[PDB]
């Protein structure tokens, strides 16, 4: 099972398997290079993020301590531990077991403990104090927290086997067996109803009251293996929110699911019939192959890729290098320039050229690089060093310059540069100056002007543009060369590529299924001969040789030659023209076949723009991309794209090496092309990473849509988006602030998927407020092409809205305290909590004589016996006593000063001040009621923790719960909340039979409605008001075949 | 940015002053090690000297020439007696 | 141009209430705070 790619060849007993490098057995096998997150996971542990914590057990009358069978006794174990007070605690996937970790788990501390870290998980992380969070960052933190919870819950629950039960209550009933130990503890949790309750306690009474039928497996898939079915429905404690999110994730997987037969056909198409994958496969009942995708996602991803590339030449060189290595071992053709030397059998012009050649170097990267550039036509430019051209424009009499000219002429058709023909023509004119005359339309450009200066169409000469305009008499050799170039100028080609049904193609500036080539290609024929003038390159070489012979015929261009080298020169040129190189033949047939095979092989889709060999007006000048919608107007800023002025990155390669290779090509004598290609391709195909790249791209696309939606959700934009937590505090963040929060979300996502590769970095690069991505390019004549893709929606956003509404309903359960609190020391024997104290004791907001103070309100202080009364906001000076309303923002502005003014009032003052809080995180401390309590020191510490930048979670001191009368001692507390937030407490004092008055909490019937209420149907929901802690759930077992191919011949 | 701690006309005036008109107004950049050719920001300053510097910049821009142009001119002036060369790359903003 | 302080404000006094004493806070100010202050031209006074 270690193998993730399994390939078996039909023509050899040598199966080749591709696996993740993390495996311990990479023996003679391909491995998966792309960094890819494992979206699909199987859960071996409970998917539970919340566990109730019981503060102190309460039990009263009890029928039995252990079930009696023979001399043995079955022990009674409560899945819920007994408590005077019990509250659930947050630890996402606390009971889960899996090999892969999302690394996004959230643990919230128990009520006696501080959970501030989760609240401060985002912007509040940088706090020296464990407690304390910045308020305006709270909304962003909550949103990110929900996002992390969802990412952490991206798992699939693996279907598992069941067992007949021998416990008496469900003896013979089938219980799914949890792994190894605690299974009975796990059984008690899944089937508390199974656990007996002979003892009397609120838990026991509740268990006795529970319905017997609402337990065990609700239903199973008819197909099953042993005790395990493909899917099953069972009754157990669970959280609906996670199940619903997983259902949405599963639905995405179901849409993505792809079929094996389609894969076999696609693999055959990619092989181009060189190799074919076989599927005589026994069907997997749960076989799962999620490979459904849209080319629009690919287009968005490629736009992201270009922005991410940000012109990194460093990234490009390695891909080209790996491709060249592949071409070097993917081509059976052998290059022998030394064979050319032996055929020459060599003051010698041949010796001069041989010394210039310096053939000792054994590296052939440039030719392979040239092919790769042809593949990426739009983003690649081939350029030639002027030094490759003859020095000083060459010399009419220079034989070495003649060698340079011949090599240059050979590689000139090869150059992708559009104005390269103009440059070669200019180069010939430069050598011809003083022998043939060329008119110049522009004074700025001279006949001797360096051709490289003419790098653009607008600089193409009108005399150059019309051959007839130039006098044939003025430059007859040049006139002939122009006619010959028109007669034999090379033809570029376009070839069909890609499979639309699955991978498809995202091509926009080019046809999606068509691959552009700068070289016309013809059908491969193994029997083809070495000599072929029909091949464009062979014809070009022959014409160039004859033209040069004609030029050197009179020796007018080379006066001062005592002996005629015309005969010798003609012979050497004739041998060169007639050289039986197979390199052109290979480029004509073998090169196209290899390129066609590698096109699917390419991990990154090449960028190309339409080829216009002679269409100067329709030659595109540049490509523009936009992050904003057309209507919006925004500042243009410095960007990476500027570093490449050319849309195609300019590349200079060694002309001599390429020309020598072109003159020196031979295949193996007994080579079988089909055999060689199938043998090389089979391991290479077994090495495919395209699926991994596609998966990463799809994740990036989903992330982009989710990000734009979230940006609208947490920012003020024209588009309407539902935000029900605007009450949650937030300031108006600058675009940069939102971007930084977004970058933290991105880092979280990468760690969640364990991504070792950069993700959406161009998206995090800048311009976070980008209305719309759009791209266009224009021609020299000025015609332009604009491509804009359409946004596909993100499931994450919909799940987020649902969770947001759930949080708004359950924020008290969520652990954040909405509302404000009032400051008043109170000592009493009543149990009223700060959440639920006597209301009359709190001065209500709509109360007369309460004091609000103006920011500039006149302030008076008394020293050395002075007595001051503060002038009020109304302007009436009053003593520092009574009920006052203080805005928190004013307090943060003057926290130290306010504390100092009321420090005496705070410690012993009866003056009561209300600071408006709206919402805040809170901290809970249990205390002993029968001992004296003073929070004044504690209140001082909390106030000191309060700071102008941000405030600490409110510290609450609460008594230990009691089911029986207990003695009490005075307790002093100055913190009074304005509302009850005790809904979080699961139960109180299970032992007590009944309560005449005051607070009492029991196990919630609604959360256990299916067990508590027989009438209620199992699938009936109380959401969002009531979330059942225990519910019937569906667990399914599926099997996923990763890339697998059986390679054979075509029928 | 100064704390008000006063009812001074200055304190009232600061409260009156627009909160959002602060920080860089705009810049010609975003990439790391990619300096903005120009940047706009709200700040305490005097408009007249800024206007003078802008006119000075306008005259300098009026005389500015591109490096490729310089290479061609120098090569022509050398007349092949000597050769000067420039590499091919986008303007990085060098005033000529 | 730089503002120069001409006449400062008068403080401190026993009668003056000091919950308020602004001088007690002593916050650095963008402009001179004084009974009389006038702008002055100092070309490149802060320039480097």
Numbering used by the authors:
A (entry chain C): 217 to 562, 571 to 1275
B (entry chain B): 410 to 505
C (entry chain B): 266 to 313
According to the publication:
The outer layer consists of 600 copies each of μ1 and σ3. Here we demonstrate that vitrification of infected cells followed by cryo-focussed ion beam (cryo-FIB) milling and cryo-electron tomography (cryo-ET) allows high resolution reconstruction of assembly intermediates of a mammalian reovirus, allowing atomic models to be constructed which throw light on some of these fundamental questions.
The star shaped icosahedral particles comprise 120 major proteins with additional density features on the outside. Since the 60 copies each of the A and B molecules account for the large majority of the density for these particles we henceforth term them single-layered particles (SLPs). The maximum diameter of the SLPs is very similar to the corresponding layer of virion-like particles, however whilst the latter are roughly spherical the SLP is collapsed inwards at the icosahedral fivefolds by 100 Å, to give the characteristic star shaped cross-section. Due to the radically different configurations of the SLP and virion-like particle the contacts between the molecules differ markedly between the two particles. Overall the contacts in the SLP are significantly weaker, with different residues involved. The 120 copies of λ1 are decorated with additional density at 120 sites. There are no significant sites of unexplained density in the interior of the λ1 layer of the SLP that might be attributed to the λ3 polymerase.
